[PDB]
Design a protein around this nucleic acid. Structure first.
Ligand SMILES: Nc1ncnc2c1ncn2[C@@H]1O[C@H](C[C@@H](N)CC[C@H](N)C(=O)O)[C@@H](O)[C@H]1O
Ligand SMILES: [K+]
Length: 568
DNA sequence: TGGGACTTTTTGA
DNA sequence: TTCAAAAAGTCCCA
């Protein structure tokens, strides 16, 4: 039988909106096989022939049908031993099917049609007496009053972020799941909590979820809950690899238990090449045991609020830098997010747009995107922002409102602050403070494959795809902008930032203040030469005609100085 | 269809 | 009053 045929057809029958609204995305066979084998390979069926295995978001049964197959083999291979040890009339091969359905397999899901599909599949596992009772619940698993705990829990919970959940349901989650769910958290945090809570003492859970909670600020409470309530046996981190075809998400597999053990050591498997096609191989285990993955151990007792999951060389490197640097960016700098207009099409125009003849130049600001940020310098802006907060009233600037911004008035009126009357329909939603942008400052893209910190000399504005900071006045005599972009753009600081950065998709990390401002910095005898090399690079890059190859050589020299400074 | 360039505004606090 | 986080990303193309 093909346990993945009907579920795949059902998933293909749905549209994008319904799948996103319920997280209806099913797990490929190679992942299911690994997780089921991980949980059930060494189960002692003679000691415990009544194992309770749960998928609380079972869908059409990608996990539970495989659980059925493994359990059938487990019972069948030991049928005469069970017969001798226990009721000899109960333990026959012809009874295994019934037993598995009555006592061992449990599923829950909000989706009534998927439950119906799974019920038919489990029934069709045996050509069939009485009607066998199957333990499938059509319910919201986060609200169900669960009547008992489970020996094994496996699956793939729905992933739904703070924009796609409804506010009423989010009120429920904020009230009832506050130990792991606050602010910009995700629904799968709540599923982690529920799974941990209904796992028996000595039970084992194994799930594939997004990887982002391993590093995200929103995941802090969830990480604390996990490390305080279960022993984490294993983390498989796929980084930016594409595990779910046609899905823009990055994955990890957590296996944990509630066993009374003095172990506290976690096996960490981290992929090396993000470009591998996982499904091209027979099993995940063979990939984990090859040169395609790196393995190392982490002492669970040494985890802080942050989980730094790196090998010994990277740990030594990170610790050297942390110990050597007496300052962080947060100590010496003021950080801020870019403008949020709330409807960019209304306020952002190409600088050559004829409509800008209608707008007085005192309202216009230079506007850049993340792609305009290079190491050390920003591209020339191609766009202009109408800083519409400076429009006093409607009458005096009628054309601007009628012929440019008003084209999106309906959309503009749907913004939260306009509906509440806090913002006029033509104003920017979060216009911040002009004075913060209209000064020398450092700017960096919010998502990038590498450190790209640039000095802005042109009072550029940007949306939230670009973050900025300026150096506090009291630290200007200890750190200049040129020195800071020198060390921040170095190979050393790229590796150092990525030790703890939030890995988003293939070749993309978040560069957000909650981690960028934690970067630590130093000043020593190499300060002057590092700064001079940075100035040389900057001067080359701003030259209209100069070829930039020498920049690389200058950078190599700078990296060497930085390594000497940090003893690495 | 799979891979690469690129990134809005809604939202809780 | 007003901050900053959040990829079951978006979107285009060979
Ligand atoms: N509140 C909920 N309670 C229970 N199930 C839910 C809830 N919300 C969504 N679901 C289901 O969660 C499932 C998540 C899917 N990724 C299916 C996972 C399934 N275990 C599989 O790996 O194939 C979807 O089928 C949803 O219908
Ligand atoms: K017996």
């Amino acid at each position: 039988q093909d346990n993945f045929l009907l579920s795949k057809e059902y998933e293909n029958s749905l549209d994008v909106d319904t799948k996103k609204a319920s997280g209806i995305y099913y797990t490929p066979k190679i992942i299911v096989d690994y997780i089921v084998k991980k949980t059930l390979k060494n189960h002692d069926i003679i000691k415990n022939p009544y194992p309770r295995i749960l998928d609380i978001s079972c869908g059409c049964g990608n996990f539970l049908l495989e659980v059925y197959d493994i359990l059938y083999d487990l019972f069948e291979e030991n049928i005469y031993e069970l017969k001798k040890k226990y009721d000899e009339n109960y333990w026959t091969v012809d009874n295994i099917h019934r037993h598995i359905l009555n006592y061992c397999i449990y599923g829950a899901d909000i989706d009534e049609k998927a439950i119906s599909i799974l019920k038919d599949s489990l029934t069709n596992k045996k050509v069939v007496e009485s009607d066998i009772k199957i333990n499938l619940f059509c319910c919201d698993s986060l609200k169900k009053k669960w009547r008992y705990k489970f020996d094994y829990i496996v699956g793939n919970p729905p992933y739904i972020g703070h924009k796609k959940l409804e506010k009423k349901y989010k009120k429920f989650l904020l009230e009832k799941y506050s130990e792991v769910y606050k602010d910009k958290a995700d629904l799968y945090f709540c599923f982690y909590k529920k799974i941990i809570d209904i796992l028996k003492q000595g039970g084992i859970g194994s799930v594939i979820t997004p990887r982002y909670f391993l590093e995200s600020l929103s995941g802090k409470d969830l990480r604390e809950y996990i490390k305080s309530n279960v022993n984490v046996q294993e983390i498989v981190d796929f980084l930016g690899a594409n595990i779910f075809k046609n899905i823009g998400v990055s994955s990890c597999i957590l296996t944990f238990d509630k066993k009374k053990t003095k172990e506290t050591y976690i096996d960490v498997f981290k992929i090396k090449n993000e470009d591998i096609c996982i499904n091209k191989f027979e099993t995940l285990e063979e990939l984990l045991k090859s040169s395609k993955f790196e393995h190392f151990n982490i002492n669970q007792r040494l985890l802080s609020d942050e989980w730094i999951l790196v090998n010994k060389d990277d740990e030594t490197f990170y610790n050297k830098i942390q110990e050597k640097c007496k300052y962080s960016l947060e100590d010496i700098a003021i950080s801020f997010q870019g403008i949020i207009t709330g409807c960019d099409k209304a306020f952002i125009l190409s600088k050559d747009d004829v409509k800008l003849n209608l707008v007085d130049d005192k309202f216009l600001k230079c506007w850049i995107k993340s792609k305009n940020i290079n190491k050390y310098i920003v591209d020339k802006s191609e766009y202009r922002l109408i800083y519409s907060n400076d429009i006093d009233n409607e009458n005096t600037n009628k054309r601007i409102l009628d012929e440019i911004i008003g084209l999106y008035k309906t959309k503009l009126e749907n913004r939260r602050e306009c509906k509440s009357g806090i913002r006029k329909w033509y104003e920017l939603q979060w216009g911040r403070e002009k004075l913060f942008f209209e000064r020398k400052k450092i700017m960096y893209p919010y998502k990038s494959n590498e450190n790209r910190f640039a000095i802005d000399y042109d009072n550029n504005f940007s949306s939230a795809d670009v973050y900025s900071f300026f150096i506090k006045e009291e630290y200007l005599d200890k750190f200049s902008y040129e020195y800071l972009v020198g060390i921040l753009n170095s190979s050393v600081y790229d590796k150092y930032f990525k030790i703890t950065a939030k890995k988003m998709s293939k070749n993309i990390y978040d560069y957000y203040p909650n981690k960028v401002m934690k970067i630590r910095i130093f000043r020593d005898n190499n300060y002057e030469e590092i700064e001079n090399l940075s100035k040389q690079i900057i001067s080359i890059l701003l030259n209209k005609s100069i070829d930039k190859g020498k920049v690389e050589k200058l950078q190599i020299k700078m990296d060497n100085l930085i390594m000497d400074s940090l003893g690495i």
